[PDB]
């Protein structure tokens, strides 16, 4: 059996293990980092990734490094763009022998 | 915090490129990707794409969660730099109210 990505949305985890821990609303939130609420609306449905400053403003409201959400998100972009051509990559480029 | 930034493109020439003795065009042409997607990641232009992140895994026998986190180190640094102060000082920490 070969292995495999499946994509978790950063949102995903936004919503499950802070605003549901803490009860905060998705607008709640928004105006507490100071953006728009769509902003975080558009993250927890998982139709937006989370940005570099976007990173910052939670780290900085949850008490977490910026870096925690990013990695999130690389994940994320990581399983979904392997799902789309990783298969192909393998394929066609041949690893390194130095 | 984090301030100053180590463009990937750096890493790749330092630790990769060179220590290989790979140039850039021949990086491109082993990965399947034009030239000028290296050339820009190389001279600090571009950033790694998912995609090209996938691409130097495979080739150079990394993850390629390393050069996504060597991206988004990239990426906070610059945005700290530029917006990191504005965005402590306009936003009061949940665990502080």
């Known amino acids: ?16 293990e802070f ?3 803490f009860d ?9 980092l100071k953006v728009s609420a769509p ?10 990734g989370i940005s ?6 939670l780290g ?10 990013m990695n999130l998100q690389s994940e994320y972009s990581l399983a979904t763009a392997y799902a789309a051509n990783g298969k192909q990559i393998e394929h066609e480029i041949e690893p390194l022998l130095a």
């Not at 059996?1 to 499950?16: V, Y």
């Open 52 to 57: 570099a400053d976007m990173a910052i403003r």
């Open 60 to 69: 900085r409201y949850f008490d977490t490094s910026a870096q925690f959400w």
């Open 39 to 48: 902003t975080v609306n558009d993250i927890v449905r998982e139709q937006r």
């Open 19 to 21: 605003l549901m821990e």
């Open 24 to 32: 905060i609303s998705p607008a709640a939130l928004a105006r507490a």
């Open 1 to 16: 059996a070969t292995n495999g990505m499946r994509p978790i949305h950063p949102g995903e985890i936004l919503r499950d």
